[PDB]
Amino acid sequence: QVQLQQSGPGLVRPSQTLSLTCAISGDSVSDNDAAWNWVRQSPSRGLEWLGRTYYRSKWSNEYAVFVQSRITINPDTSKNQFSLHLNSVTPEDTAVYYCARATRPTGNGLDIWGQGTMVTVSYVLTQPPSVSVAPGQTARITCGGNNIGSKSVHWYQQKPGQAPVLVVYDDSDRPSGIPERFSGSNSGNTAALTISRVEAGDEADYYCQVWDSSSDHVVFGGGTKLTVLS
Amino acid sequence: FLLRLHTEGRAEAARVQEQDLRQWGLTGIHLRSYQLEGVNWLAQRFHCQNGCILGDEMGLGKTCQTIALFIYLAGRLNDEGPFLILCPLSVLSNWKEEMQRFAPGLSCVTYAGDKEERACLQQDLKQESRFHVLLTTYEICLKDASFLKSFPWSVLVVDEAHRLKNQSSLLHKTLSEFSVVFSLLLTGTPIQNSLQELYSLLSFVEPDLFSKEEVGDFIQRYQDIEKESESASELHKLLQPFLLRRVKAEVATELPKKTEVVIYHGMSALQKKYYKAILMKDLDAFENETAKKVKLQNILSQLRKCVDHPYLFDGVEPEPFEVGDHLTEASGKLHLLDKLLAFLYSGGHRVLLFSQMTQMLDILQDYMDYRGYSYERVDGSVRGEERHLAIKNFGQQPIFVFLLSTRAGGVGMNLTAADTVIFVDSDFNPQNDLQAAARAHRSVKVIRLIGRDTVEEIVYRKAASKLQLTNMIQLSEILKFGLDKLLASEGSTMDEIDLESILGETKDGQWVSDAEGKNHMYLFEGKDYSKEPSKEDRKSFEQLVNLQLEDRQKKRQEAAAKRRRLIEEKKRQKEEAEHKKKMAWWETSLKYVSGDVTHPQAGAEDALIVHCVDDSGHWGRGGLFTALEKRSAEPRKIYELAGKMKDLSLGGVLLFPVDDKESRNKGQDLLALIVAQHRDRSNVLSGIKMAALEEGLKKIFLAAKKKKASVHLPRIGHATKGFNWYGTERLIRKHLAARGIPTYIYYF
Ligand SMILES: Nc1ncnc2c1ncn2[C@@H]1O[C@H](COP(=O)(O)OP(=O)(O)O)[C@@H](O)[C@H]1O
Ligand SMILES: [Mg+2]
């Protein structure tokens, strides 16, 4: 496990520059198997990928087209941190920002996440917005993409007010600590997450995420809210 | 007795000494005796069989031993064949780190990533010996077994191979059909736990010797748990060239235990009073989780802040600002830290001291400057061993305490002399503390001060119970920790058994440290929990807080006096342009910086520079005055004017700009000249008074709130001014920082 803590103003005025610094403790910034991503979340705009920076014999920053003209993500090897800067911030940017780490041994599946800073001012894949289930029964969340079998799926579970937690990586590989009942699947143009013996503690949002290599950026899912009948 | 080589006459071969390995590419570390013997064993076994099992106990250097085996068979017979390392996911980072820290000449490639990385690593199939060690997790190798079944692998290394104890494992069946010359298993747990699993690993090693059909026979030949020497020598001689396990007890050259000791301290009257006050601050109004999830987070933050020291909150510090013997007495934690640092100085142990709270960092720094200890810092700006106190300290001039922070621990420093660590501000996750304490080595003693029967107690007990949930894998109740019956006496319960218990905890050697009761608790791989049983006191206090002639002549005299004042004020006004700028009644982070306050770049825009003077200073001294002279020479003339006409007294500041700014016309470097020195210049005498600096800070805060510009202040040092510098920093916080003004203090 690694820790990714973050600091910044949770109250940025309009037409300002939103700056947010995420410090790493437990790993190096220039890790050859890591890429550091900034991602924001809001009930309106959803859960959008903002940007990322990586080091593969050459420091490379990759930004989303949403803010490609007004964003800057800069590393700092001395302080072992990464800073995000957003220019001419609009009230549409009012959200909750997280820093995550895409790790190659996990298929860059954003293993560990940050804590979340609430800032107040090209690929389709569908999810079922609402799925119910009864205790003991088995639930299935379908991530319908366009030939998603040719990509690696990453399933995260987010509790209310909690940060996203990676549940399965590389289609079906499960990180340590997650109960074995959560199983991943991916075939053709359909991926799936299967929860056997649904308990009361399983009610949360469930997202699926992949990486579009044509436009070169991370694409998340719409989300799925699990409902248990305790 | 000539029958030495009676074992089939096999020759004695040779011994691989450490210099040979160091010559063949090893650079990282100097191996230990048993580690060198294990490398010799690995080499001798690579020469004369297909695999083996290195079953040393966890933490004995198995990873670096396999790296040393790589170095050997790469610089002894030039085996540049692919070395396939398969490990669990959590240790691939450690493998990739040690492969480049110990064997830098061996090019290490990690076969990791998604399908895109799958194809991009199918790209690098050049097989030009550009990859000497291919490192991979279990699952990525299990899925991509098609590509990982087409290499003349000379060495396979399965780390923590207890996942292979089931002979019907899918990865076992996949790895059995690989082209491997030498299959080495790394196994931390005692493989002798069950003969079935031991034989499974052996059959994975030698599939033809330890055939599967013989499992039964094997288990029937060693069903006995008794010693049975006549039949025990058989098993011992059989497993000799296949297994190698050494217990931690069998190693006297093992690194010192670095015994982590959790030490217990009490409280203070202020601490308990403010604890029960902040528990009753918002009364926990919300029902379950709508706001308790965040209100209790803030509450726990403030609780650990109070347990560290009550002076974290803005209003706890007394209005007279001067360090004394109350810093030690206002917090039992800081009192225990004082006694512990005294004992460490008596023993001669240079110690590290981390901090999650940087304001706790500032207050520890102030304590060090008080009692006279040499130290450094982690970020911001330090002055104890800089400024002018660097020449002499009451402690030894060489550094004795180091001050660090967990988030800013990646700056990189060398601390080879440190043999003691103190975790006053314990993190809720010790994972950060592991890399924090890694700097001590690279006879240590790790110590953690936490108050008894407090929130820190559960925080660390839960942290330790979670830390044990790694090998063999609410907030309301935890927060409550209803033990207040012990803190019901409203006293301090100041610990004093520690004055003897500290000497009873460690008998320090003449230069280094030399080797669960009242206060000391040694963490020696055990389970520790708590159950907060006495919550009825919490409920009781919850209910208790839920309960709650001559004046006529005075008037005429003051009328005459105000008339005289009107006349004299009109005289002064129409004498020339003589005026003030600040008046009494007219209507959070002190980040330091390095440079000269005359060039303020903090946030660009407007910049309010601050300086302190006395009546009729005019031109003199040097330093910051000379620097501002160089900056358009504005204060010299403006002051000269004000001093010509007797236009200042205790307090009051003139505002005026220097040069111009083309980047933004709205932003200018504003200036300030506070008058805080003594007005005894009638007999050309001088001196400094601090009470007027308070109202000066008041009025400059008023002005900086009106204009909302950045404030910049000097060091205000270079003399015996520690009392006023302590009080002045705290008053700058009280009036500027803690009242919402961007304040910056300039050093160097
Ligand atoms: N003589 C030594 N020199 C350098 N590091 C050592 C030494 N002995 C132990 N270590 C450290 O102890 C840690 C224990 O890891 P290791 O024993 O290789 O894995 P495992 O416990 O799974 O066999 C290693 O990361 C290593 O850095
Ligand atoms: Mg290991």
Side-chain angles (χ1 to χ4, degrees), chain A residues 167-196:
Chain A
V167 165
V168 313
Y169 62 101
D170 197 53
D171 298 352
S172 64
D173 291 332
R174 156 172 33 85
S176 60
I178 312 298
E180 81 293 338
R181 51 185 179 176
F182 301 167
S183 58
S185 303
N186 182 13
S187 59
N189 51 17
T190 294
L193 170 136
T194 305
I195 294 184
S196 184

PDB file of all heavy atoms in Angstrom, chain A residues 167-196:
ATOM      1  N   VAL A 167     -11.687  -2.497  -7.150  1.00  0.00           N
ATOM      2  CA  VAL A 167     -12.213  -3.800  -6.763  1.00  0.00           C
ATOM      3  C   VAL A 167     -11.646  -4.914  -7.631  1.00  0.00           C
ATOM      4  O   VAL A 167     -11.248  -5.961  -7.123  1.00  0.00           O
ATOM      5  CB  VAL A 167     -13.757  -3.788  -6.797  1.00  0.00           C
ATOM      6  CG1 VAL A 167     -14.305  -5.204  -6.761  1.00  0.00           C
ATOM      7  CG2 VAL A 167     -14.281  -3.000  -5.622  1.00  0.00           C
ATOM      8  N   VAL A 168     -11.613  -4.719  -8.951  1.00  0.00           N
ATOM      9  CA  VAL A 168     -10.941  -5.668  -9.835  1.00  0.00           C
ATOM     10  C   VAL A 168     -10.144  -4.903 -10.884  1.00  0.00           C
ATOM     11  O   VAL A 168     -10.548  -3.831 -11.345  1.00  0.00           O
ATOM     12  CB  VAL A 168     -11.910  -6.672 -10.521  1.00  0.00           C
ATOM     13  CG1 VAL A 168     -12.896  -7.278  -9.525  1.00  0.00           C
ATOM     14  CG2 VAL A 168     -12.632  -6.042 -11.695  1.00  0.00           C
ATOM     15  N   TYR A 169      -8.997  -5.469 -11.255  1.00  0.00           N
ATOM     16  CA  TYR A 169      -8.115  -4.895 -12.259  1.00  0.00           C
ATOM     17  C   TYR A 169      -7.807  -5.942 -13.318  1.00  0.00           C
ATOM     18  O   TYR A 169      -7.888  -7.147 -13.070  1.00  0.00           O
ATOM     19  CB  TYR A 169      -6.810  -4.370 -11.637  1.00  0.00           C
ATOM     20  CG  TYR A 169      -5.964  -5.428 -10.960  1.00  0.00           C
ATOM     21  CD1 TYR A 169      -4.857  -5.976 -11.595  1.00  0.00           C
ATOM     22  CD2 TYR A 169      -6.265  -5.870  -9.678  1.00  0.00           C
ATOM     23  CE1 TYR A 169      -4.078  -6.938 -10.976  1.00  0.00           C
ATOM     24  CE2 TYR A 169      -5.495  -6.834  -9.052  1.00  0.00           C
ATOM     25  CZ  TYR A 169      -4.403  -7.364  -9.705  1.00  0.00           C
ATOM     26  OH  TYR A 169      -3.636  -8.322  -9.081  1.00  0.00           O
ATOM     27  N   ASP A 170      -7.448  -5.459 -14.506  1.00  0.00           N
ATOM     28  CA  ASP A 170      -7.160  -6.302 -15.667  1.00  0.00           C
ATOM     29  C   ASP A 170      -8.270  -7.333 -15.876  1.00  0.00           C
ATOM     30  O   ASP A 170      -8.057  -8.547 -15.825  1.00  0.00           O
ATOM     31  CB  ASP A 170      -5.790  -6.974 -15.532  1.00  0.00           C
ATOM     32  CG  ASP A 170      -5.268  -7.504 -16.855  1.00  0.00           C
ATOM     33  OD1 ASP A 170      -5.210  -6.722 -17.828  1.00  0.00           O
ATOM     34  OD2 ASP A 170      -4.906  -8.698 -16.920  1.00  0.00           O
ATOM     35  N   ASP A 171      -9.480  -6.807 -16.083  1.00  0.00           N
ATOM     36  CA  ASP A 171     -10.686  -7.585 -16.355  1.00  0.00           C
ATOM     37  C   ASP A 171     -11.163  -8.377 -15.141  1.00  0.00           C
ATOM     38  O   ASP A 171     -12.290  -8.175 -14.677  1.00  0.00           O
ATOM     39  CB  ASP A 171     -10.470  -8.519 -17.551  1.00  0.00           C
ATOM     40  CG  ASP A 171     -10.175  -7.763 -18.831  1.00  0.00           C
ATOM     41  OD1 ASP A 171     -10.292  -6.520 -18.825  1.00  0.00           O
ATOM     42  OD2 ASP A 171      -9.824  -8.408 -19.841  1.00  0.00           O
ATOM     43  N   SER A 172     -10.330  -9.277 -14.614  1.00  0.00           N
ATOM     44  CA  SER A 172     -10.787 -10.142 -13.531  1.00  0.00           C
ATOM     45  C   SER A 172      -9.820 -10.296 -12.366  1.00  0.00           C
ATOM     46  O   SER A 172     -10.223 -10.866 -11.347  1.00  0.00           O
ATOM     47  CB  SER A 172     -11.121 -11.539 -14.073  1.00  0.00           C
ATOM     48  OG  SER A 172      -9.966 -12.173 -14.593  1.00  0.00           O
ATOM     49  N   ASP A 173      -8.578  -9.830 -12.464  1.00  0.00           N
ATOM     50  CA  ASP A 173      -7.666  -9.927 -11.333  1.00  0.00           C
ATOM     51  C   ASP A 173      -8.154  -9.055 -10.183  1.00  0.00           C
ATOM     52  O   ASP A 173      -8.559  -7.906 -10.381  1.00  0.00           O
ATOM     53  CB  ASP A 173      -6.251  -9.519 -11.744  1.00  0.00           C
ATOM     54  CG  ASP A 173      -5.605 -10.516 -12.683  1.00  0.00           C
ATOM     55  OD1 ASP A 173      -5.957 -11.712 -12.614  1.00  0.00           O
ATOM     56  OD2 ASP A 173      -4.744 -10.104 -13.487  1.00  0.00           O
ATOM     57  N   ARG A 174      -8.118  -9.611  -8.976  1.00  0.00           N
ATOM     58  CA  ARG A 174      -8.644  -8.948  -7.796  1.00  0.00           C
ATOM     59  C   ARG A 174      -7.523  -8.615  -6.825  1.00  0.00           C
ATOM     60  O   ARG A 174      -6.740  -9.505  -6.463  1.00  0.00           O
ATOM     61  CB  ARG A 174      -9.688  -9.839  -7.111  1.00  0.00           C
ATOM     62  CG  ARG A 174      -9.892  -9.561  -5.634  1.00  0.00           C
ATOM     63  CD  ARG A 174     -11.079 -10.344  -5.092  1.00  0.00           C
ATOM     64  NE  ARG A 174     -11.229 -11.639  -5.750  1.00  0.00           N
ATOM     65  CZ  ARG A 174     -10.578 -12.741  -5.395  1.00  0.00           C
ATOM     66  NH1 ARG A 174      -9.721 -12.714  -4.384  1.00  0.00           N
ATOM     67  NH2 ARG A 174     -10.783 -13.874  -6.054  1.00  0.00           N
ATOM     68  N   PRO A 175      -7.405  -7.362  -6.393  1.00  0.00           N
ATOM     69  CA  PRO A 175      -6.354  -7.005  -5.435  1.00  0.00           C
ATOM     70  C   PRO A 175      -6.620  -7.605  -4.063  1.00  0.00           C
ATOM     71  O   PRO A 175      -7.751  -7.942  -3.704  1.00  0.00           O
ATOM     72  CB  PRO A 175      -6.415  -5.475  -5.394  1.00  0.00           C
ATOM     73  CG  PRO A 175      -7.817  -5.150  -5.788  1.00  0.00           C
ATOM     74  CD  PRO A 175      -8.203  -6.193  -6.798  1.00  0.00           C
ATOM     75  N   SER A 176      -5.542  -7.728  -3.290  1.00  0.00           N
ATOM     76  CA  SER A 176      -5.629  -8.339  -1.971  1.00  0.00           C
ATOM     77  C   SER A 176      -6.528  -7.521  -1.052  1.00  0.00           C
ATOM     78  O   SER A 176      -6.526  -6.287  -1.090  1.00  0.00           O
ATOM     79  CB  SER A 176      -4.234  -8.474  -1.360  1.00  0.00           C
ATOM     80  OG  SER A 176      -3.610  -7.208  -1.231  1.00  0.00           O
ATOM     81  N   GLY A 177      -7.298  -8.220  -0.218  1.00  0.00           N
ATOM     82  CA  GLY A 177      -8.240  -7.614   0.691  1.00  0.00           C
ATOM     83  C   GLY A 177      -9.678  -7.664   0.213  1.00  0.00           C
ATOM     84  O   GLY A 177     -10.597  -7.702   1.040  1.00  0.00           O
ATOM     85  N   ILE A 178      -9.891  -7.664  -1.095  1.00  0.00           N
ATOM     86  CA  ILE A 178     -11.249  -7.733  -1.645  1.00  0.00           C
ATOM     87  C   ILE A 178     -11.772  -9.159  -1.497  1.00  0.00           C
ATOM     88  O   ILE A 178     -11.043 -10.116  -1.811  1.00  0.00           O
ATOM     89  CB  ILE A 178     -11.249  -7.293  -3.110  1.00  0.00           C
ATOM     90  CG1 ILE A 178     -10.484  -5.978  -3.274  1.00  0.00           C
ATOM     91  CG2 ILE A 178     -12.668  -7.145  -3.629  1.00  0.00           C
ATOM     92  CD1 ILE A 178     -11.090  -4.817  -2.518  1.00  0.00           C
ATOM     93  N   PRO A 179     -13.002  -9.358  -1.021  1.00  0.00           N
ATOM     94  CA  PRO A 179     -13.524 -10.723  -0.887  1.00  0.00           C
ATOM     95  C   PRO A 179     -13.658 -11.405  -2.242  1.00  0.00           C
ATOM     96  O   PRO A 179     -13.925 -10.768  -3.263  1.00  0.00           O
ATOM     97  CB  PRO A 179     -14.890 -10.521  -0.221  1.00  0.00           C
ATOM     98  CG  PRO A 179     -15.255  -9.100  -0.514  1.00  0.00           C
ATOM     99  CD  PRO A 179     -13.958  -8.350  -0.530  1.00  0.00           C
ATOM    100  N   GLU A 180     -13.473 -12.728  -2.234  1.00  0.00           N
ATOM    101  CA  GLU A 180     -13.422 -13.510  -3.465  1.00  0.00           C
ATOM    102  C   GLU A 180     -14.749 -13.544  -4.212  1.00  0.00           C
ATOM    103  O   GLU A 180     -14.770 -13.968  -5.373  1.00  0.00           O
ATOM    104  CB  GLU A 180     -12.976 -14.941  -3.159  1.00  0.00           C
ATOM    105  CG  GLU A 180     -14.083 -15.854  -2.639  1.00  0.00           C
ATOM    106  CD  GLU A 180     -14.582 -15.461  -1.260  1.00  0.00           C
ATOM    107  OE1 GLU A 180     -13.842 -14.770  -0.529  1.00  0.00           O
ATOM    108  OE2 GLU A 180     -15.718 -15.844  -0.909  1.00  0.00           O
ATOM    109  N   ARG A 181     -15.847 -13.117  -3.587  1.00  0.00           N
ATOM    110  CA  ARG A 181     -17.145 -13.159  -4.251  1.00  0.00           C
ATOM    111  C   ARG A 181     -17.243 -12.171  -5.406  1.00  0.00           C
ATOM    112  O   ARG A 181     -18.077 -12.363  -6.297  1.00  0.00           O
ATOM    113  CB  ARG A 181     -18.259 -12.896  -3.237  1.00  0.00           C
ATOM    114  CG  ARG A 181     -18.049 -11.655  -2.388  1.00  0.00           C
ATOM    115  CD  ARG A 181     -19.128 -11.542  -1.328  1.00  0.00           C
ATOM    116  NE  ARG A 181     -18.957 -10.367  -0.480  1.00  0.00           N
ATOM    117  CZ  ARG A 181     -19.809 -10.011   0.474  1.00  0.00           C
ATOM    118  NH1 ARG A 181     -20.894 -10.740   0.697  1.00  0.00           N
ATOM    119  NH2 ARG A 181     -19.581  -8.927   1.203  1.00  0.00           N
ATOM    120  N   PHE A 182     -16.417 -11.127  -5.414  1.00  0.00           N
ATOM    121  CA  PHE A 182     -16.413 -10.157  -6.505  1.00  0.00           C
ATOM    122  C   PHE A 182     -15.568 -10.718  -7.641  1.00  0.00           C
ATOM    123  O   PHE A 182     -14.350 -10.877  -7.496  1.00  0.00           O
ATOM    124  CB  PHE A 182     -15.869  -8.809  -6.036  1.00  0.00           C
ATOM    125  CG  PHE A 182     -16.649  -8.182  -4.905  1.00  0.00           C
ATOM    126  CD1 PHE A 182     -16.118  -7.113  -4.202  1.00  0.00           C
ATOM    127  CD2 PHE A 182     -17.906  -8.647  -4.554  1.00  0.00           C
ATOM    128  CE1 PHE A 182     -16.821  -6.527  -3.165  1.00  0.00           C
ATOM    129  CE2 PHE A 182     -18.610  -8.064  -3.516  1.00  0.00           C
ATOM    130  CZ  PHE A 182     -18.067  -7.003  -2.823  1.00  0.00           C
ATOM    131  N   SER A 183     -16.200 -11.019  -8.773  1.00  0.00           N
ATOM    132  CA  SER A 183     -15.517 -11.627  -9.907  1.00  0.00           C
ATOM    133  C   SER A 183     -15.682 -10.764 -11.150  1.00  0.00           C
ATOM    134  O   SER A 183     -16.764 -10.232 -11.410  1.00  0.00           O
ATOM    135  CB  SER A 183     -16.047 -13.040 -10.177  1.00  0.00           C
ATOM    136  OG  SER A 183     -17.439 -13.023 -10.434  1.00  0.00           O
ATOM    137  N   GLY A 184     -14.603 -10.630 -11.918  1.00  0.00           N
ATOM    138  CA  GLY A 184     -14.625  -9.866 -13.143  1.00  0.00           C
ATOM    139  C   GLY A 184     -14.740 -10.748 -14.371  1.00  0.00           C
ATOM    140  O   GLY A 184     -14.394 -11.928 -14.350  1.00  0.00           O
ATOM    141  N   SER A 185     -15.242 -10.159 -15.454  1.00  0.00           N
ATOM    142  CA  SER A 185     -15.377 -10.867 -16.719  1.00  0.00           C
ATOM    143  C   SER A 185     -15.325  -9.857 -17.854  1.00  0.00           C
ATOM    144  O   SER A 185     -15.721  -8.702 -17.689  1.00  0.00           O
ATOM    145  CB  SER A 185     -16.686 -11.665 -16.783  1.00  0.00           C
ATOM    146  OG  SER A 185     -16.787 -12.579 -15.705  1.00  0.00           O
ATOM    147  N   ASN A 186     -14.852 -10.309 -19.013  1.00  0.00           N
ATOM    148  CA  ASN A 186     -14.764  -9.448 -20.186  1.00  0.00           C
ATOM    149  C   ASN A 186     -14.736 -10.323 -21.430  1.00  0.00           C
ATOM    150  O   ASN A 186     -13.903 -11.229 -21.527  1.00  0.00           O
ATOM    151  CB  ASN A 186     -13.516  -8.558 -20.119  1.00  0.00           C
ATOM    152  CG  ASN A 186     -13.408  -7.610 -21.298  1.00  0.00           C
ATOM    153  OD1 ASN A 186     -14.360  -7.433 -22.057  1.00  0.00           O
ATOM    154  ND2 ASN A 186     -12.243  -6.991 -21.454  1.00  0.00           N
ATOM    155  N   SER A 187     -15.637 -10.052 -22.373  1.00  0.00           N
ATOM    156  CA  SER A 187     -15.709 -10.836 -23.598  1.00  0.00           C
ATOM    157  C   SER A 187     -16.392 -10.008 -24.676  1.00  0.00           C
ATOM    158  O   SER A 187     -17.426  -9.383 -24.418  1.00  0.00           O
ATOM    159  CB  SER A 187     -16.467 -12.149 -23.370  1.00  0.00           C
ATOM    160  OG  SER A 187     -17.786 -11.904 -22.914  1.00  0.00           O
ATOM    161  N   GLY A 188     -15.807 -10.008 -25.871  1.00  0.00           N
ATOM    162  CA  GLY A 188     -16.403  -9.312 -27.000  1.00  0.00           C
ATOM    163  C   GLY A 188     -16.612  -7.842 -26.695  1.00  0.00           C
ATOM    164  O   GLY A 188     -15.667  -7.097 -26.413  1.00  0.00           O
ATOM    165  N   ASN A 189     -17.873  -7.414 -26.746  1.00  0.00           N
ATOM    166  CA  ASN A 189     -18.252  -6.037 -26.459  1.00  0.00           C
ATOM    167  C   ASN A 189     -19.023  -5.920 -25.147  1.00  0.00           C
ATOM    168  O   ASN A 189     -19.925  -5.090 -25.024  1.00  0.00           O
ATOM    169  CB  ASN A 189     -19.068  -5.459 -27.616  1.00  0.00           C
ATOM    170  CG  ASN A 189     -20.224  -6.354 -28.027  1.00  0.00           C
ATOM    171  OD1 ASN A 189     -20.634  -7.245 -27.283  1.00  0.00           O
ATOM    172  ND2 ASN A 189     -20.757  -6.116 -29.221  1.00  0.00           N
ATOM    173  N   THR A 190     -18.681  -6.747 -24.158  1.00  0.00           N
ATOM    174  CA  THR A 190     -19.381  -6.722 -22.878  1.00  0.00           C
ATOM    175  C   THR A 190     -18.443  -7.180 -21.771  1.00  0.00           C
ATOM    176  O   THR A 190     -17.880  -8.276 -21.848  1.00  0.00           O
ATOM    177  CB  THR A 190     -20.629  -7.611 -22.919  1.00  0.00           C
ATOM    178  OG1 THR A 190     -21.580  -7.064 -23.842  1.00  0.00           O
ATOM    179  CG2 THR A 190     -21.263  -7.708 -21.538  1.00  0.00           C
ATOM    180  N   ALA A 191     -18.276  -6.348 -20.749  1.00  0.00           N
ATOM    181  CA  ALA A 191     -17.619  -6.733 -19.511  1.00  0.00           C
ATOM    182  C   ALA A 191     -18.662  -6.832 -18.405  1.00  0.00           C
ATOM    183  O   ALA A 191     -19.788  -6.346 -18.536  1.00  0.00           O
ATOM    184  CB  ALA A 191     -16.523  -5.731 -19.136  1.00  0.00           C
ATOM    185  N   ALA A 192     -18.275  -7.452 -17.297  1.00  0.00           N
ATOM    186  CA  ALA A 192     -19.238  -7.701 -16.236  1.00  0.00           C
ATOM    187  C   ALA A 192     -18.525  -7.836 -14.900  1.00  0.00           C
ATOM    188  O   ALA A 192     -17.382  -8.296 -14.827  1.00  0.00           O
ATOM    189  CB  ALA A 192     -20.067  -8.959 -16.521  1.00  0.00           C
ATOM    190  N   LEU A 193     -19.224  -7.420 -13.849  1.00  0.00           N
ATOM    191  CA  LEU A 193     -18.809  -7.632 -12.470  1.00  0.00           C
ATOM    192  C   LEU A 193     -19.906  -8.409 -11.759  1.00  0.00           C
ATOM    193  O   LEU A 193     -21.072  -8.002 -11.780  1.00  0.00           O
ATOM    194  CB  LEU A 193     -18.537  -6.303 -11.756  1.00  0.00           C
ATOM    195  CG  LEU A 193     -18.315  -6.349 -10.243  1.00  0.00           C
ATOM    196  CD1 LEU A 193     -17.143  -5.470  -9.846  1.00  0.00           C
ATOM    197  CD2 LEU A 193     -19.572  -5.914  -9.503  1.00  0.00           C
ATOM    198  N   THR A 194     -19.537  -9.523 -11.136  1.00  0.00           N
ATOM    199  CA  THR A 194     -20.487 -10.424 -10.503  1.00  0.00           C
ATOM    200  C   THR A 194     -20.226 -10.462  -9.006  1.00  0.00           C
ATOM    201  O   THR A 194     -19.102 -10.743  -8.573  1.00  0.00           O
ATOM    202  CB  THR A 194     -20.388 -11.831 -11.099  1.00  0.00           C
ATOM    203  OG1 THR A 194     -20.563 -11.761 -12.519  1.00  0.00           O
ATOM    204  CG2 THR A 194     -21.453 -12.735 -10.507  1.00  0.00           C
ATOM    205  N   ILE A 195     -21.264 -10.176  -8.223  1.00  0.00           N
ATOM    206  CA  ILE A 195     -21.199 -10.188  -6.767  1.00  0.00           C
ATOM    207  C   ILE A 195     -22.094 -11.317  -6.279  1.00  0.00           C
ATOM    208  O   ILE A 195     -23.326 -11.224  -6.356  1.00  0.00           O
ATOM    209  CB  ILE A 195     -21.625  -8.842  -6.165  1.00  0.00           C
ATOM    210  CG1 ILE A 195     -20.632  -7.745  -6.550  1.00  0.00           C
ATOM    211  CG2 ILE A 195     -21.758  -8.953  -4.653  1.00  0.00           C
ATOM    212  CD1 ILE A 195     -20.925  -6.404  -5.909  1.00  0.00           C
ATOM    213  N   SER A 196     -21.481 -12.385  -5.783  1.00  0.00           N
ATOM    214  CA  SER A 196     -22.216 -13.497  -5.203  1.00  0.00           C
ATOM    215  C   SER A 196     -22.369 -13.288  -3.702  1.00  0.00           C
ATOM    216  O   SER A 196     -21.484 -12.742  -3.040  1.00  0.00           O
ATOM    217  CB  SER A 196     -21.504 -14.822  -5.482  1.00  0.00           C
ATOM    218  OG  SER A 196     -22.255 -15.920  -4.993  1.00  0.00           O
TER     219      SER A 196
END
